[PDB]
Every structure is written in structure tokens, then in C-alpha cells.
Amino acid sequence: ETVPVKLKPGMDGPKVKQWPLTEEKIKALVEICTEMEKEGKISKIGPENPYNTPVFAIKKSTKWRKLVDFRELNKRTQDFWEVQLGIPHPAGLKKNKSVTVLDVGDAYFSVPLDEDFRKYTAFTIPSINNETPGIRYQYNVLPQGWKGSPAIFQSSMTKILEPFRKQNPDIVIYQYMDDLYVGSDLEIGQHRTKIEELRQHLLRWGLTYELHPDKWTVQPIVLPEKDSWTVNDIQKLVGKLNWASQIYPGIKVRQLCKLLRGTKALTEVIPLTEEAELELAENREILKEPVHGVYYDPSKDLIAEIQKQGQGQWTYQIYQEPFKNLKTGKYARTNDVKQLTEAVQKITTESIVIWGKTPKFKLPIQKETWETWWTEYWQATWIPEWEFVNTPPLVKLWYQL
Amino acid sequence: PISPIETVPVKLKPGMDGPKVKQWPLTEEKIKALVEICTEMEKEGKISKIGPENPYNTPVFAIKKKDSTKWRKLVDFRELNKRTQDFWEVQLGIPHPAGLKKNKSVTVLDVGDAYFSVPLDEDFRKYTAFTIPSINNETPGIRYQYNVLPQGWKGSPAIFQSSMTKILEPFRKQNPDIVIYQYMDDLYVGSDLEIGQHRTKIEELRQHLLRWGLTTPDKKHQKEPPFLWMGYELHPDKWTVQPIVLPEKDSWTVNDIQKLVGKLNWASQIYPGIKVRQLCKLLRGTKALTEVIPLTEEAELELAENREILKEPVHGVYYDPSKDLIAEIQKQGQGQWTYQIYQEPFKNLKTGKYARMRGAHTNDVKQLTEAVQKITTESIVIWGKTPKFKLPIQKETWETWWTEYWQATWIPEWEFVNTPPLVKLWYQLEKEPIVGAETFYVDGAANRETKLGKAGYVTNRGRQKVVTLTDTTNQKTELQAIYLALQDSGLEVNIVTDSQYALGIIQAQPDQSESELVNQIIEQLIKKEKVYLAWVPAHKGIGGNEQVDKLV
Numbered sequence: 001e002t003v004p005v006k007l008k009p010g011m012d013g014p015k016v017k018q019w020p021l022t023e024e025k026i027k028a029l030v031e032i033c034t035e036m037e038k039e040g041k042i043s044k045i046g047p048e049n050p051y052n053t054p055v056f057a058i059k060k061s062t063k064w065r066k067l068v069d070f071r072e073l074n075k076r077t078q079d080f081w082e083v084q085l086g087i088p089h090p091a092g093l094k095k096n097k098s099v100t101v102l103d104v105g106d107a108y109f110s111v112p113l114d115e116d117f118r119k120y121t122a123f124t125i126p127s128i129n130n131e132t133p134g135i136r137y138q139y140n141v142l143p144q145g146w147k148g149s150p151a152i153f154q155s156s157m158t159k160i161l162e163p164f165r166k167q168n169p170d171i172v173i174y175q176y177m178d179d180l181y182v183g184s185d186l187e188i189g190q191h192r193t194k195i196e197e198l199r200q201h202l203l204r205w206g207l208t209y210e211l212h213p214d215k216w217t218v219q220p221i222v223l224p225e226k227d228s229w230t231v232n233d234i235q236k237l238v239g240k241l242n243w244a245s246q247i248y249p250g251i252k253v254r255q256l257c258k259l260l261r262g263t264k265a266l267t268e269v270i271p272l273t274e275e276a277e278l279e280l281a282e283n284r285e286i287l288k289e290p291v292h293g294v295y296y297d298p299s300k301d302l303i304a305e306i307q308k309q310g311q312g313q314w315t316y317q318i319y320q321e322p323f324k325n326l327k328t329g330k331y332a333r334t335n336d337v338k339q340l341t342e343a344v345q346k347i348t349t350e351s352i353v354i355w356g357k358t359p360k361f362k363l364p365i366q367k368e369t370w371e372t373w374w375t376e377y378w379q380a381t382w383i384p385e386w387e388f389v390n391t392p393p394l395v396k397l398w399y400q401l
Numbered sequence: 402p403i404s405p406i407e408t409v410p411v412k413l414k415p416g417m418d419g420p421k422v423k424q425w426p427l428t429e430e431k432i433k434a435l436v437e438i439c440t441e442m443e444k445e446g447k448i449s450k451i452g453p454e455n456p457y458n459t460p461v462f463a464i465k466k467k468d469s470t471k472w473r474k475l476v477d478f479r480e481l482n483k484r485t486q487d488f489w490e491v492q493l494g495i496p497h498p499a500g501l502k503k504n505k506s507v508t509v510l511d512v513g514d515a516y517f518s519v520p521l522d523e524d525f526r527k528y529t530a531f532t533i534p535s536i537n538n539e540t541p542g543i544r545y546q547y548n549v550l551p552q553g554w555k556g557s558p559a560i561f562q563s564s565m566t567k568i569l570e571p572f573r574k575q576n577p578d579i580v581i582y583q584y585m586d587d588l589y590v591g592s593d594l595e596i597g598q599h600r601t602k603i604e605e606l607r608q609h610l611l612r613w614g615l616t617t618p619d620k621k622h623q624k625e626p627p628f629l630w631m632g633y634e635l636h637p638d639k640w641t642v643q644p645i646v647l648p649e650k651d652s653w654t655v656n657d658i659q660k661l662v663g664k665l666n667w668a669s670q671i672y673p674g675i676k677v678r679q680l681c682k683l684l685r686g687t688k689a690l691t692e693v694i695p696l697t698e699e700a701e702l703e704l705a706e707n708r709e710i711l712k713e714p715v716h717g718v719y720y721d722p723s724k725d726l727i728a729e730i731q732k733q734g735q736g737q738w739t740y741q742i743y744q745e746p747f748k749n750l751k752t753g754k755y756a757r758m759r760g761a762h763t764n765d766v767k768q769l770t771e772a773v774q775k776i777t778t779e780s781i782v783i784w785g786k787t788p789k790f791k792l793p794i795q796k797e798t799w800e801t802w803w804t805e806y807w808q809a810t811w812i813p814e815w816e817f818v819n820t821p822p823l824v825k826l827w828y829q830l831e832k833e834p835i836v837g838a839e840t841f842y843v844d845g846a847a848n849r850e851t852k853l854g855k856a857g858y859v860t861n862r863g864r865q866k867v868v869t870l871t872d873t874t875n876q877k878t879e880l881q882a883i884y885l886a887l888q889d890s891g892l893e894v895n896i897v898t899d900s901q902y903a904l905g906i907i908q909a910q911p912d913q914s915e916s917e918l919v920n921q922i923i924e925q926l927i928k929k930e931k932v933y934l935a936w937v938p939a940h941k942g943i944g945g946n947e948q949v950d951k952l953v
């Protein structure tokens with residue numbers, strides 16, 4: 001039985017260009033795709049299917065996994081997986097001591113896909129140097145990566161989990177795309193034991209890492225504490241406070257740019273004053289805490305900005321409206337884009353757990369550069385949306401750790 | 402002549418229905434030609450006669466052939482095409498020679514009547530109904546519908562290639578060592594077999610094709626190396642661009658120069674160090690295609706330099722999958738990069754150039770990286786792997802820049818090669834403020850409707866100066882104030898600004914810019930021995946800033 005799937009009215013299916021792939025990945029892809037089609041999960045298609053979505057290969061661990069970018073299709077089915085049914089997000093997942101993530105994407109290969117929808121899942125395996133025509137398939141079953149699959153499999157998932165939920169009321173289990181998020185406050189050993197227990201239920205219906213979200217704390221905008229202070233140091237200080245002021249209600253710089261009078265040499269050392277030293281402390285109190293006045297709005301996109309801090313350090317902020325930081329963080333520790341990619345995956349993962357959606361990223365890197373390389377390090381089964389931007393040199397500085 | 406291949410299901414866009422276009426009257430010689438053409442086509446199965454049952458119709462007409470005395474049936478599918486579903490695009494692109502493997506013998510087979518040899522979907526045929534008009538439209542016409550892919554219909558190119566690819570598949574799967582490329586009507590076939598055993602492999606293909614409806618002319622008329630293909634000249638184990646003739650002219654039109662550029666750009670695929678900068682600067686501006694553009698001196702010498710390079714033939718080499726690709730890049734006229742890609746030095750598989758400004762302000766290290774990135778994507782498309790690079794930059798130069806810059810970046814495995822001019826950083830800004838260097842607090846600021854600007858500075862050594870700039874922007878004034886401070890200070894100097902914009906520019910360490918001012922500011926930065934640039938919030942009462950802020 002196939003739950004009929006309708007696109008958003010007035011939109012057509014995706015027609016996205018296949019990126020060029022390396023010989024090594026193409027070959028992995030044919031292997032994978034010939035096996036998938038014997039099994040009848042995908043079928044070869046004719047020219048009368050005009051649609052396309054991008055496909056590539058990653059390492060899940062020496063073994064190729066296939067990854068379809070349904071970012072565009074997802075946008076065009078949206079209404080469906082977001083507001084017809086559509087999986088509700090547990091508010092306490094982010095409060096657990098331990099949450100484990102498990103891949104249950106294999107489950108969707110079981111369920112048939114609505115025939116009048118299959119044609120929208122078309123993808124192409126390109127050939128090197130354009131020497132032969134791409135080989136072309138659509139899906140016959142719920143595809144991994146399409147946000148429709150968990151929405152449709154939803155009904156079967158709560159059935160699979162009911163006894164286990166019934167037996168552990170205080171364990172939280174949230175599905176997102178191809179992953180199951182399972183959280184508890186058990187001690188880590190007892191948590192791992194419940195996970196294996198859960199794996200056994202899953203195992204009877206078809207099926208084959210650890211977060212501690214309650215230890216996620218914000219990265220404050222930090223104010224240096226100095227032995228001695230220069231004009232230059234105080235100006236930097238007045239800058240940073242002035243930015244934090246456009247966000248954090250309460251920030252006061254009055255007593256501080258007091259010290260900065262006239263026309264002093266940048267290297268002149270200027271005395272600390274009480275009411276200044278007090279303004280600096282009182283400002284620290286504020287930067288420590290959540291932003292008074294900022295809330296998640298379930299109907300707006302999440303944005304995530306990242307800044308390259310150098311030396312393997314990256315800073316980030318998540319907001320819906322600019323400067324109203326919902327969260328702020330860092331990521332630490334070779335390869336600039338490898339790191340960026342890890343950082344995006346870390347940030348995406350936290351975002352899924354807290355709000356139950358992926359942010360659109362503002363990436364400090366050359367489009368072409370990122371487009372070339374990111375698949376070299378990607379390990380998630382989802383892909384967030386992203387743009388590319390040039391970090392305003394000051395923003396980098398103000399979020400410096 | 403009509404393939405037994407299964408048809409592709411077709412249908413019209415979701416809302417729409419088949420065309421119902423009125424046939425206009427034709428002259429009588431034209432009606433005569435149509436009747437005999439269509440009578441030939443009908444006896445061959447291509448079309449067949451229908452009754453007035455069929456609601457749909459599409460205009461036909463006929464034209465005289467090639468100054469000769471034949472006619473060709475033309476059908477106007479405008480409306481059918483507008484009502485027909487979209488298809489998968491045929492080719493994502495065409496192979497590059499540099500990516501081709503070498504073959505002893507090659508043969509081109511041409512599929513006769515390609516489209517009329519592929520059946521058209523039974524359910525869709527009705528929508529192709531056309532009518533041959535009777536004389537003066539007095540009596541009802543002769544009505545036909547297509548049974549095969551019509552010339553000029555929207556789906557024919559896509560359905561033919563797919564058809565040919567299903568049919569080709571077995572032969573391919575059974576002859577992995579022999580290679581076939583399909584493009585439209587033609588089949589290009591390559592083997593490392595010897596002329597005898599290859600021609601035998603051809604016949605098996607031909608007879609396989611014929612088993613499937615597709616006829617091909619024979620072994621008596623099949624051409625020889627070299628082969629002309631997509632603007633290239635292909636030989637068994639080398640390749641080159643088709644012969645490129647640069648005219649001798651005393652007067653060049655806008656049009657002549659455009660053609661001249663295109664041919665040079667084309668030649669640059671395999672001819673090393675072709676430059677078009679000076680010829681391209683001629684195109685800048687608005688001029689008719691017929692108008693004459695006096696070449697400049699630089700442009701006249703470029704054309705000269707190019708004409709030498711093209712003198713001696715050069716060829717490219719084909720790809721050996723078992724060896725790495727090396728890519729080498731050189732600097733040329735500012736913003737121009739050339740590159741070669743080889744597997745054995747220095748037998749190039751191909752060459753090329755890169756010349757693009759990203760942003761208004763770049764430096765050589767940014768440009769080189771963009772070129773590495775562009776060349777890497779090209780290699781993946783052509784060869785399916787990335788090249789080992791050789792680059793005119795010290796590992797230390799690149800390493801200083803990567804960290805200095807706030808943008809993320811990465812280039813594959815590469816090594817230094819000493820091929821001047823070397824790319825480098827021409828200055829570096831101080832990380833920390835400088836002791837014993839004058840601190841200039843600068844500030845520029847315009848009037849939004851007047852466009853009158855005042856730039857200037859105050860100093861901790863009590864020096865100060867303001868100037869009046871005319872018809873400039875608030876942008877340009879903040880930059881002029883930086884320039885001012887660079888001119889009037891010594892070899893060391895700390896500059897304090899309020900312009901995040903100006904900060905952005907300089908902090909990125911440009912060495913090129915569209916801007917005259919910025920190139921001025923750069924010249925100064927080079928000559929200095931220490932510059933520290935710092936930013937402060939505008940009108941937030943910051944000591945030094947307010948002073949030079951009121952005073953403007």
C-alpha cells in the first residue's frame with residue numbers, strides 16, 4: 001500500500017544538474033545501483049522523465065555509501081512532510097544526559113513509493129568525459145534522504161516502538177530523516193544497555209554515536225582580562241561591547257570609552273578605573289547568560305553562521321533574525337574544508353536535537369572550492385542548505401574565543 | 402527502416418490538449434511535391450492515412466532544395482511542441498580530446514534516416530496529424546499522422562538517443578575493449594584492433610544495428626585519419642584543434658575582432674600561452690559590429706605574439722589511466738594565468754588559461770587558488786581524477802596567506818616550481834599596534850545629495866589636515882582618508898578608522914583593484930615598513946575618532 005504523495009501546488013518536480021564525480025565514486029555508484037535494482041528498489045528510466053536530483057558517494061569505515069541530495073525535492077514536497085502528517089519534536093531530547101543516534105534508513109527500502117510520485121525521484125550516474133549517456137533511475141520505494149519517507153513510515157515506526165516505549169516511559173525517541181534519536185538520563189552503561197535492547201526490537205523489523213546535549217553550553221562573547229590596558233586594547237574593548245550591545249540588552253560602554261579621551265597613541269597604556277572596571281564586570285554577567293528577548297519561532301528558517309578563527313578553531317551562531325542569537329558555539333580541531341564540514345555536521349546535529357530542523361548555513365568559503373571538496377568528508381545522510389559569504393572581518397574578531 | 406524497439410510513452414503537458422491549427426492554402430507546385438513526398442513516406446510506414454475522425458491538425462509546407470530541383474517536407478510543430486511534455490536533456494556536454502584514449506583504427510558510421518527509423522508512441526501519434534491542402538482549399542485535404550519520430554518535434558532528439566542507447570547496450574557489454582561514442586545521427590567507433598579484425602568488428606555492429614532497424618552506409622566509403630570532429634582534428638594517437646587561420650587585415654571590425662578572439666580562445670586549448678587581454682580590451686564599450694577599431698600597440702603586439710605561437714603545429718596527447726596528471730600554472734599579464742596538463746613532461750594532454758577577477762580586489766594568491774580550483778573541476782570532468790599540481794608559489798608564501806585570510810581554503814597535493822614571475826605577498830599588515838609610530842585617526846564623509854566630501858586626520862603628535870573631495874561617495878572618502886595618512890606619515894604608522902568597508906578592503910591585502918584610489922593606497926602600503934590598521938565604532942564618542950570627526 002502506497003500513501004499518495006502530492007507536490008506543493010504550482011510547483012513542478014526538481015531538475016537539478018548532476019555534479020561531476022570522480023571515477024572512483026562513479027564505479028562505487030554503479031555497483032551500488034545495480035544491486036539496488038536487482039532488488040527492485042530502483043528502476044531504469046526513459047527520456048520521458050525530465051526530472052533529476054544529484055547523486056554522490058560517501059564513506060559512512062572502508063565501504064562506499066550512496067547519497068542522494070533531495071534538498072530541492074524536499075522543498076517541493078514540503079507541504080507534505082511538514083503539514084499533513086509530520087513528526088513532532090520532543091522538547092526534552094535536548095535535556096537528556098545521553099542521546100544516541102541510529103541509522104534506520106534501511107527500513108524505508110521496505111515500503112513502496114506512490115507510483116505517481118516515483119518519477120520525481122529520478123537521478124543520473126554521470127560518465128567520465130561525457131563519453132556515454134548518464135544512466136538513469138527512479139525509486140520504487142521510500143528513498144533515504146527524502147523528507148517524505150519518515151512522514152510516511154511514521155505510522156509503522158510508532159508501532160515498532162510501542163512496546164519499547166511502553167516499557168521505558170522515560171526514554172525519548174525522536175525520528176528525523178533517516179535517523180532515530182534516543183535519549184535518557186541513565187548512567188552511560190545503563191543507557192548503552194537500553195540502546196542494545198532497542199536495537200533488538202528494530203532488528204525484528206529490518207535494521208543493522210553518542211551525544212550529551214545537557215552538557216552543551218553557550219560560547220560567550222568573551223572580554224579579555226588584562227594585567228595592563230592600552231588605548232588599542234580599550235578600543236577593541238569598546239568595539240566588542242558595542243556589537244554585543246546590538247544583541248544583549250543591558251550592555252553599557254559609557255564608563256569605558258571615558259578612558260579613551262583626546263588623541264592618544266595606540267600603544268599608550270591607560271589606567272583602569274573603578275566604574276570602568278565595574279562596567280566591565282557587570283557586562284560580563286550579561287554576556288554569560290541567554291539573550292533576553294530571543295525565542296525560537298517554529299515558522300521561520302534557522303540560520304547558522306561560521307567564522308574561521310584560525311588554528312583549527314571555528315566559531316558559530318544560530319539565529320532566525322540576525323544578531324538575535326538562539327545559540328552560540330565553537331568547534332576545535334590539517335584541512336580547512338574538512339574542518340568546516342565537520343563543523344557543519346556538528347552544528348546541524350545539535351540543531352536537529354534542539355529544534356528538530358536543519359539550519360541554512362552561511363559558509364566562509366569559495367562556492368566552487370566547497371562544491372568540489374565537501375563530499376570528501378561528509379558523513380551525514382542529510383544535507384543542510386547553504387550559501388557562501390565573506391565573513392565581515394569584525395564579526396570574526398568579536399566572536400573570537 | 403523502422404526499429405522494432407519498444408516506444409517511449411509520451412504525453413502532453415498536464416492541462417493542455419493536442420494542437421488544432423488551421424492549414425493554410427499552398428501553391429500548386431507545393432501541393433504536388435507534398436503528395437509525392439508523403440506517398441513515398443506512407444509506403445515506407447513513416448506516416449499513415451487517417452479519417453476526419455481525428456480532431457487534431459498541424460501545418461505543413463514545402464521548400465526547394467539547395468538551389469537544386471528537389472523539395473523537402475517541412476512541418477511546423479510550434480504548437481505541438483509548446484504542448485508537449487519536457488524530456489530529459491540529451492547531452493550534459495561533449496567529450497574533450499584530452500580525455501580520449503588512443504586507438505589504432507577508427508571508423509565513423511552514419512545512421513540513415515535516424516528519426517524516421519524510430520517508432521513513435523502509438524497513443525501520441527494522433528497529435529501529429531497534418532493535412533495536405535487541396536487546390537485552392539476547395540475540397541477536403543489528405544490527412545496523415547506520424548508513426549515515427551518527426552523532424553522538428555520536441556521529443557525526437559531525446560527519444561532517438563535513448564533508443565540508440567538501448568540498442569547499443571548489448572554490443573557494448575560484449576565488446577568492452579572497443580569504444581563507441583554516439584552523437585545525433587553519427588556513431589564514432591574506436592578499437593585497438595588491427596585494420597582487418599576491426600573492420601570485422603564493424604560489420605558485427607552494423608549487422609546488429611540493422612537487426613534493429615538502423616541502416617548505415619558501408620565499408621567502401623569510410624574515411625581516413627585524421628578525423629575532423631567538433632572543431633578538432635583527431636589522429637590515432639595525437640589530437641589538435643582544427644586549422645586556425647588569423648587574417649591579414651589593415652582594418653578590423655568589431656565583428657572581425659570577436660571572431661579573432663573566439664579562434665584564439667579555441668586555439669588556447671592546446672597552444673600554450675595564447676593571450677587575448679589586449680584584443681579583448683578593444684571590445685569594451687558600445688560599437689556596431691560593422692565599425693572599425695584601430696588596434697592599439699599592446700594589441701598589435703599581442704596579435705603578433707599569437708601569430709608566432711600558431712605558426713608551428715602543436716598536438717595534444719591522449720590519456721593513459723595508469724599515470725598521474727600533472728598540472729602546471731604560470732602568471733602572465735596581470736590577472737592572466739596559463740596552464741598545461743601532461744602525464745609525461747612535456748607532452749600536454751591539453752592546455753588553457755584563466756583570467757577572472759573575483760570581487761573588485763584580489764591578490765595573486767587568491768587568483769592562483771581560483772585557478773587551481775577551476776583546473777581541478779575540469780580534470781574531474783575530463784579524467785575523473787584530480788591532478789598533482791606544480792605552482793609558482795613557495796609553500797611558505799601560501800601558508801602565511803591561508804592563516805592570515807579569514808576565508809576557508811584548500812588545494813590538493815601540490816609542489817613549488819620556480820617559474821617566474823613568482824606569486825607572493827607584497828606587504829603584510831601588523832598584527833599588533835606599533836610603538837613609537839605616529840597614530841593617525843582618520844575619517845572621510847560625504848553629503849548625500851551634494852556629493853561633496855571631506856577627508857582628513859588628527860594625530861597623537863598633534864598634526865592634522867582635512868581636504869575637500871568633489872563628487873565622491875562616503876565610501877571613497879573613508880578610503881581617501883587612509884591614503885592621506887599613508888602619504889603624510891613615515892615608514893611606520895598606526896592608522897585608526899571607522900570604516901568597516903575600508904578595513905575590509907585592506908585587511909584582505911589586495912594587490913590589484915579596479916579602483917585608482919585603492920591602487921594608490923596599495924603602492925603606499927608596499928613602500929611602508931610597518932602599518933597597523935585598526936577599527937573603531939563611528940560616533941560612539943571614542944577619544945581619537947571624535948576629534949577628526951568634528952573637524953570634517
Ligand SMILES: Cc1cc(C#N)cc(C)c1Oc1nc(Nc2ccc(C#N)cc2)nc(N)c1Br
Nearest residue numbers: 131501502504582589590591628630635636637
Ligand atoms: C571513436 C571516436 C571517433 C571520433 C572521431 N572523429 C570521436 C570520438 C569522441 C570517438 O570516441 C572515442 N575516441 C577515443 N579516442 C580516439 C582516438 C583516436 C582517434 C582518431 N583518429 C579518435 C578518437 N577515446 C574514447 N574513449 C572514445 Br568514447
Ligand SMILES: [Cl-]
Nearest residue numbers: 294295296297
Ligand atoms: Cl525558545
